[PDB]
Tab-separated table of all heavy atoms in Angstrom:
chain	number	residue	atom	x	y	z
H	124	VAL	N	0.651	80.467	-39.797
H	124	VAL	CA	0.431	81.850	-39.383
H	124	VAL	C	0.538	81.981	-37.872
H	124	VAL	O	1.025	82.993	-37.355
H	124	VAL	CB	-0.930	82.354	-39.898
H	124	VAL	CG1	-0.836	82.711	-41.365
H	124	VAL	CG2	-2.002	81.308	-39.676
H	125	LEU	N	0.074	80.970	-37.138
H	125	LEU	CA	0.151	81.013	-35.683
H	125	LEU	C	1.511	80.579	-35.162
H	125	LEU	O	1.987	81.121	-34.160
H	125	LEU	CB	-0.931	80.127	-35.070
H	125	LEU	CG	-2.384	80.462	-35.383
H	125	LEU	CD1	-3.286	79.353	-34.897
H	125	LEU	CD2	-2.758	81.773	-34.733
H	126	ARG	N	2.156	79.625	-35.827
H	126	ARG	CA	3.326	78.974	-35.260
H	126	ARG	C	4.635	79.644	-35.666
H	126	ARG	O	5.499	79.868	-34.816
H	126	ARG	CB	3.330	77.499	-35.661
H	126	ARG	CG	4.536	76.726	-35.179
H	126	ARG	CD	4.618	76.672	-33.671
H	126	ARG	NE	3.323	76.433	-33.052
H	126	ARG	CZ	3.171	75.896	-31.852
H	126	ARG	NH1	4.211	75.497	-31.140
H	126	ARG	NH2	1.946	75.760	-31.352
H	127	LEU	N	4.810	79.963	-36.943
H	127	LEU	CA	6.070	80.539	-37.395
H	127	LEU	C	6.189	81.993	-36.966
H	127	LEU	O	5.211	82.743	-36.984
H	127	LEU	CB	6.201	80.441	-38.913
H	127	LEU	CG	6.788	79.152	-39.486
H	127	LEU	CD1	7.344	79.406	-40.872
H	127	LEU	CD2	7.857	78.578	-38.578
H	128	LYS	N	7.394	82.385	-36.580
H	128	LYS	CA	7.652	83.778	-36.248
H	128	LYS	C	7.571	84.623	-37.512
H	128	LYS	O	8.117	84.227	-38.546
H	128	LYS	CB	9.022	83.930	-35.593
H	128	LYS	CG	9.492	85.364	-35.482
H	128	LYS	CD	10.926	85.454	-35.016
H	128	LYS	CE	11.007	85.985	-33.598
H	128	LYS	NZ	12.402	85.981	-33.079
H	129	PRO	N	6.893	85.768	-37.480
H	129	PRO	CA	6.757	86.571	-38.700
H	129	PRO	C	8.116	86.972	-39.256
H	129	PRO	O	9.015	87.378	-38.521
H	129	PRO	CB	5.951	87.786	-38.234
H	129	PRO	CG	5.219	87.309	-37.032
H	129	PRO	CD	6.130	86.335	-36.358
H	130	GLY	N	8.251	86.857	-40.575
H	130	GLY	CA	9.501	87.102	-41.258
H	130	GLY	C	10.275	85.859	-41.642
H	130	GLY	O	11.140	85.941	-42.520
H	131	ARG	N	9.996	84.718	-41.020
H	131	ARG	CA	10.680	83.482	-41.368
H	131	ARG	C	10.231	82.997	-42.738
H	131	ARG	O	9.049	83.068	-43.081
H	131	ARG	CB	10.407	82.399	-40.323
H	131	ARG	CG	10.942	82.702	-38.937
H	131	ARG	CD	12.455	82.754	-38.903
H	131	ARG	NE	12.946	83.221	-37.614
H	131	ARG	CZ	14.069	83.904	-37.442
H	131	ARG	NH1	14.852	84.215	-38.462
H	131	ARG	NH2	14.422	84.274	-36.215
H	132	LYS	N	11.181	82.502	-43.521
H	132	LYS	CA	10.872	81.982	-44.843
H	132	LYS	C	10.245	80.597	-44.741
H	132	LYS	O	10.502	79.844	-43.799
H	132	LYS	CB	12.132	81.923	-45.704
H	132	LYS	CG	13.093	83.071	-45.483
H	132	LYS	CD	12.521	84.376	-46.000
H	132	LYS	CE	13.621	85.333	-46.416
H	132	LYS	NZ	14.798	84.624	-46.986
H	133	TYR	N	9.413	80.266	-45.723
H	133	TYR	CA	8.769	78.964	-45.764
H	133	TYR	C	8.509	78.586	-47.213
H	133	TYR	O	8.470	79.442	-48.099
H	133	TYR	CB	7.464	78.943	-44.960
H	133	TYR	CG	6.508	80.062	-45.297
H	133	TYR	CD1	5.427	79.846	-46.137
H	133	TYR	CD2	6.685	81.332	-44.771
H	133	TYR	CE1	4.556	80.865	-46.446
H	133	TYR	CE2	5.822	82.353	-45.075
H	133	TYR	CZ	4.759	82.117	-45.912
H	133	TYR	OH	3.896	83.142	-46.212
H	134	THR	N	8.342	77.292	-47.447
H	134	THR	CA	8.060	76.778	-48.777
H	134	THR	C	6.644	76.233	-48.833
H	134	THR	O	6.013	75.957	-47.812
H	134	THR	CB	9.045	75.675	-49.171
H	134	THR	OG1	8.547	74.410	-48.728
H	134	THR	CG2	10.360	75.912	-48.520
H	135	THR	N	6.151	76.070	-50.053
H	135	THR	CA	4.862	75.448	-50.298
H	135	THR	C	5.095	74.092	-50.947
H	135	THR	O	5.899	73.969	-51.884
H	135	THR	CB	3.977	76.329	-51.176
H	135	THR	OG1	4.090	77.690	-50.749
H	135	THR	CG2	2.533	75.903	-51.045
H	136	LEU	N	4.401	73.079	-50.430
H	136	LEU	CA	4.669	71.711	-50.844
H	136	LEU	C	4.414	71.511	-52.328
H	136	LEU	O	5.097	70.708	-52.963
H	136	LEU	CB	3.832	70.737	-50.020
H	136	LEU	CG	4.473	69.373	-49.773
H	136	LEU	CD1	5.947	69.520	-49.468
H	136	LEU	CD2	3.761	68.641	-48.659
H	137	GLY	N	3.448	72.228	-52.901
H	137	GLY	CA	3.215	72.116	-54.331
H	137	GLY	C	4.384	72.621	-55.152
H	137	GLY	O	4.783	71.992	-56.136
H	138	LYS	N	4.955	73.759	-54.754
H	138	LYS	CA	6.130	74.290	-55.436
H	138	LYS	C	7.307	73.329	-55.323
H	138	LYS	O	7.993	73.043	-56.314
H	138	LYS	CB	6.489	75.651	-54.847
H	138	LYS	CG	7.285	76.538	-55.766
H	138	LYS	CD	8.059	77.577	-54.972
H	138	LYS	CE	9.234	78.103	-55.763
H	138	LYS	NZ	9.664	77.123	-56.795
H	139	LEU	N	7.543	72.804	-54.118
H	139	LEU	CA	8.636	71.854	-53.942
H	139	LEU	C	8.412	70.593	-54.766
H	139	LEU	O	9.348	70.064	-55.377
H	139	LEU	CB	8.795	71.505	-52.464
H	139	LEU	CG	9.950	70.555	-52.163
H	139	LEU	CD1	11.227	71.344	-52.048
H	139	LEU	CD2	9.690	69.752	-50.905
H	140	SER	N	7.175	70.099	-54.795
H	140	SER	CA	6.868	68.887	-55.542
H	140	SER	C	7.061	69.091	-57.035
H	140	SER	O	7.590	68.210	-57.724
H	140	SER	CB	5.442	68.448	-55.242
H	140	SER	OG	5.425	67.439	-54.256
H	141	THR	N	6.635	70.242	-57.557
H	141	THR	CA	6.888	70.539	-58.960
H	141	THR	C	8.380	70.590	-59.238
H	141	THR	O	8.845	70.093	-60.268
H	141	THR	CB	6.234	71.859	-59.353
H	141	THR	OG1	4.953	71.963	-58.726
H	141	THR	CG2	6.061	71.930	-60.854
H	142	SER	N	9.149	71.185	-58.326
H	142	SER	CA	10.587	71.274	-58.542
H	142	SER	C	11.259	69.910	-58.508
H	142	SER	O	12.283	69.713	-59.169
H	142	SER	CB	11.215	72.198	-57.508
H	142	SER	OG	11.319	73.510	-58.024
H	143	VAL	N	10.719	68.961	-57.742
H	143	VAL	CA	11.342	67.645	-57.645
H	143	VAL	C	10.702	66.616	-58.567
H	143	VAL	O	11.132	65.456	-58.572
H	143	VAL	CB	11.356	67.134	-56.191
H	143	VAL	CG1	12.120	68.101	-55.316
H	143	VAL	CG2	9.951	66.939	-55.669
H	144	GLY	N	9.692	66.997	-59.346
H	144	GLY	CA	9.239	66.136	-60.423
H	144	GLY	C	7.780	65.733	-60.414
H	144	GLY	O	7.399	64.775	-61.092
H	145	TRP	N	6.950	66.447	-59.658
H	145	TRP	CA	5.521	66.166	-59.620
H	145	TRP	C	4.839	66.802	-60.825
H	145	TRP	O	5.087	67.968	-61.147
H	145	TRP	CB	4.924	66.686	-58.318
H	145	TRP	CG	3.455	66.549	-58.212
H	145	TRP	CD1	2.715	65.430	-58.431
H	145	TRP	CD2	2.534	67.578	-57.850
H	145	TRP	NE1	1.386	65.697	-58.229
H	145	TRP	CE2	1.248	67.011	-57.871
H	145	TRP	CE3	2.672	68.925	-57.513
H	145	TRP	CZ2	0.111	67.742	-57.567
H	145	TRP	CZ3	1.543	69.648	-57.213
H	145	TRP	CH2	0.278	69.057	-57.241
H	146	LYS	N	3.973	66.037	-61.487
H	146	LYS	CA	3.535	66.360	-62.836
H	146	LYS	C	2.135	66.956	-62.916
H	146	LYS	O	1.623	67.128	-64.024
H	146	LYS	CB	3.605	65.109	-63.713
H	146	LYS	CG	4.940	64.905	-64.394
H	146	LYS	CD	5.427	63.474	-64.263
H	146	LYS	CE	4.610	62.528	-65.113
H	146	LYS	NZ	5.476	61.592	-65.874
H	147	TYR	N	1.501	67.289	-61.793
H	147	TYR	CA	0.090	67.665	-61.848
H	147	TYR	C	-0.202	68.906	-61.024
H	147	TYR	O	-1.237	68.994	-60.358
H	147	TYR	CB	-0.799	66.511	-61.398
H	147	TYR	CG	-0.482	65.235	-62.122
H	147	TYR	CD1	0.318	64.267	-61.542
H	147	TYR	CD2	-0.977	65.004	-63.391
H	147	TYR	CE1	0.617	63.103	-62.209
H	147	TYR	CE2	-0.683	63.847	-64.064
H	147	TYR	CZ	0.113	62.900	-63.469
H	147	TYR	OH	0.404	61.743	-64.145
H	148	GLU	N	0.681	69.901	-61.071
H	148	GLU	CA	0.381	71.149	-60.381
H	148	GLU	C	-0.664	71.959	-61.139
H	148	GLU	O	-1.528	72.594	-60.526
H	148	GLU	CB	1.653	71.970	-60.177
H	148	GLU	CG	1.394	73.357	-59.608
H	148	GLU	CD	2.596	73.945	-58.896
H	148	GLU	OE1	3.708	73.897	-59.457
H	148	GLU	OE2	2.427	74.466	-57.774
H	149	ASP	N	-0.607	71.946	-62.472
H	149	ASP	CA	-1.549	72.735	-63.260
H	149	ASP	C	-2.946	72.132	-63.230
H	149	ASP	O	-3.939	72.859	-63.123
H	149	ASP	CB	-1.053	72.863	-64.697
H	149	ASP	CG	0.025	73.909	-64.844
H	149	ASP	OD1	0.315	74.602	-63.848
H	149	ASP	OD2	0.585	74.038	-65.951
H	150	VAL	N	-3.046	70.808	-63.331
H	150	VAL	CA	-4.347	70.154	-63.259
H	150	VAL	C	-4.999	70.421	-61.912
H	150	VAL	O	-6.194	70.739	-61.831
H	150	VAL	CB	-4.193	68.646	-63.521
H	150	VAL	CG1	-5.534	68.026	-63.862
H	150	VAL	CG2	-3.182	68.408	-64.628
H	151	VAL	N	-4.224	70.292	-60.835
H	151	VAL	CA	-4.759	70.518	-59.498
H	151	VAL	C	-5.226	71.958	-59.352
H	151	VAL	O	-6.303	72.219	-58.810
H	151	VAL	CB	-3.715	70.144	-58.428
H	151	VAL	CG1	-4.066	70.777	-57.097
H	151	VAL	CG2	-3.618	68.639	-58.286
H	152	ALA	N	-4.433	72.914	-59.840
H	152	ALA	CA	-4.818	74.319	-59.726
H	152	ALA	C	-6.084	74.617	-60.522
H	152	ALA	O	-6.958	75.356	-60.056
H	152	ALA	CB	-3.669	75.215	-60.184
H	153	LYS	N	-6.199	74.049	-61.724
H	153	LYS	CA	-7.389	74.250	-62.547
H	153	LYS	C	-8.636	73.715	-61.853
H	153	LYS	O	-9.654	74.413	-61.734
H	153	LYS	CB	-7.192	73.566	-63.898
H	153	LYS	CG	-8.215	73.920	-64.955
H	153	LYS	CD	-7.837	73.349	-66.316
H	153	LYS	CE	-6.332	73.166	-66.462
H	153	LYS	NZ	-5.949	72.704	-67.821
H	154	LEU	N	-8.572	72.467	-61.387
H	154	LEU	CA	-9.716	71.883	-60.704
H	154	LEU	C	-10.017	72.604	-59.398
H	154	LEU	O	-11.181	72.700	-58.998
H	154	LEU	CB	-9.469	70.400	-60.463
H	154	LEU	CG	-9.453	69.577	-61.747
H	154	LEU	CD1	-8.595	68.343	-61.590
H	154	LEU	CD2	-10.866	69.203	-62.135
H	155	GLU	N	-8.988	73.122	-58.725
H	155	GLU	CA	-9.199	73.897	-57.511
H	155	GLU	C	-9.933	75.193	-57.805
H	155	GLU	O	-10.811	75.597	-57.040
H	155	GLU	CB	-7.858	74.178	-56.837
H	155	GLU	CG	-7.432	73.114	-55.841
H	155	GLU	CD	-8.489	72.840	-54.796
H	155	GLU	OE1	-8.610	73.643	-53.852
H	155	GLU	OE2	-9.197	71.822	-54.917
Side-chain angles (χ1 to χ4, degrees):
Chain H
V124 282
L125 300 170
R126 177 63 42 156
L127 273 202
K128 168 188 251 176
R131 296 294 172 211
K132 323 291 208 34
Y133 51 100
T134 88
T135 318
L136 211 41
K138 203 203 158 336
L139 182 84
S140 262
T141 320
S142 266
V143 301
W145 176 51
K146 271 134 71 134
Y147 309 99
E148 173 157 47
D149 281 355
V150 197
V151 162
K153 192 172 333 184
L154 292 153
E155 270 306 282

